[model samples]
Target: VQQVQKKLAALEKQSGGRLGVALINTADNSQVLYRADERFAMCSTSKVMTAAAVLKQSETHDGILQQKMTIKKADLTNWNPVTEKYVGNTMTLAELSAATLQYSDNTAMNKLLAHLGGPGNVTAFARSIGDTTFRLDRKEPELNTAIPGDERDTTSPLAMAKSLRKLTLGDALAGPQRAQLVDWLKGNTTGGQSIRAGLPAHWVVGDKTGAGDYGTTNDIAVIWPEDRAPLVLVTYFTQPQQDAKWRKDVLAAAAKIVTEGK
Candidate 1:
């Protein structure tokens, strides 16, 4: 463990970015933490929480997932890929959730936020799930401000990991809903070069990626190794300058350091 810490310290110095990481083994409850409590801009990563909150709402509101939601041009944002193509069309809440997680579609996220009434519900959902550190103060473009040291729209790396574990592995989502949420997360296009890049291909994985101003780049995932209990991993990184280049390899390297001998 000390060796892992040493390597992480060296890697942090080499990367020249502020990196926060947290890993928890669900089976044994063993863990690792490196700058894990520090807050970082959530960027688009907060969509997972929003999606989970929607799933939770479905529990009390029947048939919510099957209901259709229209995606108009006004709802679209600069980064939307899936929603832009279907501007005048409608997709089910389930599909929107999938688009939000798998493609990081900002439009889908905004629609979900609207469905839940606003960003505060997401914050409420976090609190309901026993995570107080997570916060979502605004919608798309505004939420991604990600100014260094600003607490708005930020979550600690450890809080992210814990909330993800509860939502995915715990009882936060019902059986079918949980299955559906994991299905939406597994093929995430944005995670290709993030934490997933660091793990062995054979390990089944589900993840979300986030990017924003100040070079913020983050990835959180549930990784099921071939023969062990699943692991929840989160890495949040940010540089001092808004234009500083975000490094995918830095996150991958951090994951590698944490899972070196496991």
Candidate 2:
């Protein structure tokens, strides 16, 4: 453990920004990271909980995910990469949830939020996991990756990682619900320029990305390293280096530190 701590210590002292990290290994649930207590903006990374809440709500309703809904043009959000593409179109709840997670789509989030009964349910779902840090008071764009401000959502680096751990382990969800969440997460193509970029070939990482004004980038992911226990890596950068490369470098360092001597 000291060796892992030593490498993480080196990362924090040199990361040159407000950084918080938590690495949890699914095999034993033993975890470590630099700045373990620092709360970072969850940004879109908070969507993990949102997605879980929907999955749970639909277990009884069952037909909810398959029900068709139209995305009204009046509700379109700017700076949305995936949702914007679906404006005035129709899709099932499942498809929208996929877009919400896979593309970091805000409009799709709004749609799912409405269907999930509201942000309070998402907040309640998070608290069910015993986490008091995740904030869902703000909507996307205002909470957008392109715009960072105090008027946004947040969570501790460790809490974010733990939520992912719980979701993957089926502690928070079960059956098709658990499978639904992971399947959507695996489709995520967002944050490629950060955490995903640092990973080696053939490695699979399921994650969510968050960006804010003034160079903020955050990613919390489940990394499947071949022939070893799975690892959940949570990395956040506030007041960052004004470029994507720095976070990628730090993630590479975190991956290197955790996977070292494996």
Candidate 3:
């Protein structure tokens, strides 16, 4: 735990802004807690919760995931990594989820929100599992354009960590749904070098990343280190987007510090 603190301190020295983290040993009761002044809107990392909602809705209503839906022109988003090109095409809910989770596609996320009965439904699903810290009110393009979300779509570091804990070990999903969620996360290409950067070669990382126009970089994940019990990691930083490269180093180093020699 001390090593983790030193690493975060060093990261703060190199970084110009605040950092918040909540590291748990999932294997045991001990935890390393670091909270900043307040919560920052969790960027795309909130997709994990969205994915959970989708999974739950699917389980409760069979065949919902397989139903095909059209992708209208409005669904296309500028900064989206994958679904931007599929604007006029149609896809299943499962495919949309893959694009949203694996590549952080804004278009896919909007479509998911629509197909799943809008942001309010997502919020209600979150409540079903005891997470009250999030409010999904804004669409992706507005957030990308530096438009404030009217205080909605926000989450604190500790709250996010707790939500992830439920995803990792609680009754968040059935066994198959959990595996499906992890598979999507493991294939994530957008968060390639953040939290996963510090993982040992033998370890596996199933995670999500969030990048906001307002100087924030974040990640949350279920890491499977070969020789130890799997642990969930949640991290957030207010460093400017220009220092993105530096934060990657901090994230990698932080991960190493917490999981080293476990």
RMSD of each candidate relative to the true structure = 1.1, 2.8, 2.6
How big is the positional error of residue 98 in model 3, measured in Å on the Cα after superposition?
Answer: 0.2
Predicted structure 1: lDDT: 0.89
lDDT of 2 at 118: 76
lDDT string for model 2 (1-262, tens) is 6877776777767976666778887788777767767666677787888888878878778687788878777878865676666677887888888888988878888888887777778888889877777767767666644333353476777877877888886478877898778778778887677666767767877878776654666888888878788888888877644443435566656666765544
- The residue pairs that clash in candidate 3, if any, are none
Where is model 2 more than 4 Å wrong at Cα?
1-3, 144-152, 240-246
Q: On residues 1-262, what C-alpha lDDT tens digit does candidate 3 reach at each position?
A: 5766877787777777667777767788566677732566677887888888989877779988898888778767776667766668888899989988988988888888877777788778778888787767667756432223336677776677777777766778888787788788889987777888887777888889887765667888888778677788887776544334335656666777777776
Query: What ranking emerges by lDDT with the best candidate at the front?
Result: 1, 3, 2
Report how far off residue 81 is in candidate 2 (Å): 3.0
Off by over 4 Å in 3: 144-150, 240-246
| Evaluation by TM-score, superior candidate among 1 and 2 | 1
lDDT of 1 by residue, 187-213 (tens): 788888888888888888999999888
- Which residue pairs overlap in candidate 2's backbone? 141-144, 145-211, 148-213
User: For each predicted model, how many residue pairs clash, with residues at least 3 apart or on different chains?
Assistant: 0, 3, 0
Superior candidate under lDDT, 1 versus 3: 1
* Candidate 2 weakest ten by summed lDDT: 143-152
